[PDB]
Structure formats: structure tokens, C-alpha cells
């Protein structure tokens, strides 16, 4: 559908921001686990990958339709801890706040596009 193509980029950006938000909050929650590595995703490359499948064929009514079913990069440690935990509070707190801001911005842009498509139709 053409409607999907217009809203594909913002939807994928919003979903990627939510996933990275979950990853950052997991990094915050597991700050005290000894031996836990701080993981993160490269937002731009994954957004390229998602932006850049074959529903199985249903011959009749009984035939069952096809059933549907990111890469994590390690953060470079800054300070060496003794328990092997590489999670840094300041870095991930700033990243968490930034991801929240960008999620809000994506919501704003997507809502503006939908509202414009709506006022085009209203009449």
C-alpha cells in the first residue's frame, strides 16, 4: 500500500527507538550484575537495514496462512571495575534521556503526518 510507504520510515524509527530504549533500560537495571557487558545497537545502521516476506499461498479456505516469527554491539568500557561490570551510569543516563527525547520527536512527526493526511480528507 502507498500509505505504508509514506509512514514506513517514521514507524521503523519509532520501533527502533523503543527497542533501543528497552536495551538501555536493561543496561541500567543490570548495572550491579558482576560480569554483565553493556550492550547497545547502532541506530542508523539498523534503520538502514529495516528500511531496505513471502506469505505462503492459500489454495482454499481450510489451508492455513503463513505464520510469522537486530544485532547488539558491546559498549566500549571507560573505567575498569573489579567485578567485570562495564555499565557506566553517566553515559547510559544521557543516552536514555536522548532516546526518550527522540521517541517523543518521532511521535510528534508521525502524528503531524497522520493529522495532515486527515485534514486533507475532512470535508
Amino acid at each position: 500500500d502507498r500509505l505504508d510507504a509514506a509512514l514506513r520510515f517514521q514507524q521503523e524509527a519509532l520501533n527502533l527507538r523503543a527497542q533501543r530504549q528497552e536495551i538501555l533500560a536493561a543496561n541500567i537495571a543490570n548495572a550491579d550484575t558482576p560480569g554483565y557487558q553493556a550492550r547497545d545497537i547502532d541506530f542508523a545502521s539498523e534503520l538502514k537495514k529495516v528500511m531496505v516476506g513471502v506469505a505462503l499461498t492459500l489454495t482454499s479456505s481450510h489451508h492455513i496462512p503463513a505464520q510469522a516469527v537486530v544485532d547488539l554491539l558491546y559498549r566500549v568500557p571507560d573505567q575498569p571495575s573489579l567485578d567485570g561490570n562495564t555499565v557506566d551510569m553517566d553515559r547510559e543516563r544521557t543516552q536514555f534521556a536522548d532516546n526518550s527525547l527522540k521517541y517523543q520527536m518521532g511521535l510528534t512527526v508521525l502524528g503531524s503526518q497522520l493529522k495532515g493526511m486527515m485534514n486533507v480528507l475532512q470535508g
Binding site: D78, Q79, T94, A97, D98, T108, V109, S112, K115
Partner: protein, 133 residues
């Protein structure tokens, strides 16, 4: 990735955290006679550089490396110690106490100032996004 203000203030927070860590490690090892190898502890220093990504305009703070201080190591006459030299002077670290407390206080106040800057900017950030809607 980060917004420019976010990157600058977060780099400031990380740099102040590194300076505080160096000060705390020095204050812990103030009375250490030996390391893991048989050499005296040397007071560490952290050097702040400006991470001027553009040409001379702005930039946060980065830390190139943690250097080891070059000051006369304290000599204490203990000939019975296995680490005493021919003359018998064991080497104690050059960690000064007053300087490290002053460094801890200064690092804490810079950390809090950068935190306040981020907190102030944050409201404007969230209020920017209401311009479109």
C-alpha cells in the same frame, strides 16, 4: 547520535567521574608500600583536553590518558624491609592529602554544575517538540 548539548554535558560528567576516581584511588593508596610487582605506587593525574570536533568553535572534554606523576618519591628509612635499596630507604607514594581532597571537592562541584545545565536544558528540549503539534 547525541544532541550537541547532551554530548558536551555527558562528556563533562564522564570526565569529572574519571577525575574523582583518580582522586579516590590516590587517597586509598596513600600508605601503600608495594604494588603487585614490587614497585611503589605513583600518584595518578588526569589531563583534560577540549574535544573540539569543529575548528576551534566548541567541544566537550575528553581525557587522553592517565599519567603517572613525576615527583620525588617519599623516602622512609626502613632497612629491614625487603624493598629497601642499598641505602635502605623504602619508597612511599607521593600522594598529597590536601590536594586530593580539594580535587574531590572541585570534581564534585563541576559534576553538579553540569548536571544542573542538563536539567535546565531538558525542559526547553521537551518544549521544543510542541512547536509542530
Amino acid at each position: 547520535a547525541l544532541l550537541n548539548i547532551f554530548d558536551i554535558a555527558g562528556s563533562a560528567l564522564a570526565a569529572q567521574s574519571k577525575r574523582l576516581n583518580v582522586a579516590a584511588s590516590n587517597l586509598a593508596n596513600a600508605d601503600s608500600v608495594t604494588g603487585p610487582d614490587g614497585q611503589p605506587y605513583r600518584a595518578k593525574q588526569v589531563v583534560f583536553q577540549v574535544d573540539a570536533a569543529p575548528g576551534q568553535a566548541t567541544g566537550g572534554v575528553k581525557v587522553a590518558s592517565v599519567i603517572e606523576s613525576q615527583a620525588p618519591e617519599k623516602l622512609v628509612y626502613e632497612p629491614g624491609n625487603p624493598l629497601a635499596d642499598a641505602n635502605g630507604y623504602v619508597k612511599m607514594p607521593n600522594v598529597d592529602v590536601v590536594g586530593e581532597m580539594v580535587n574531590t571537592m572541585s570534581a564534585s562541584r563541576s559534576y553538579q554544575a553540569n548536571i544542573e545545565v542538563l536539567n535546565t536544558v531538558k525542559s526547553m528540549m521537551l518544549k521544543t517538540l510542541t512547536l509542530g503539534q
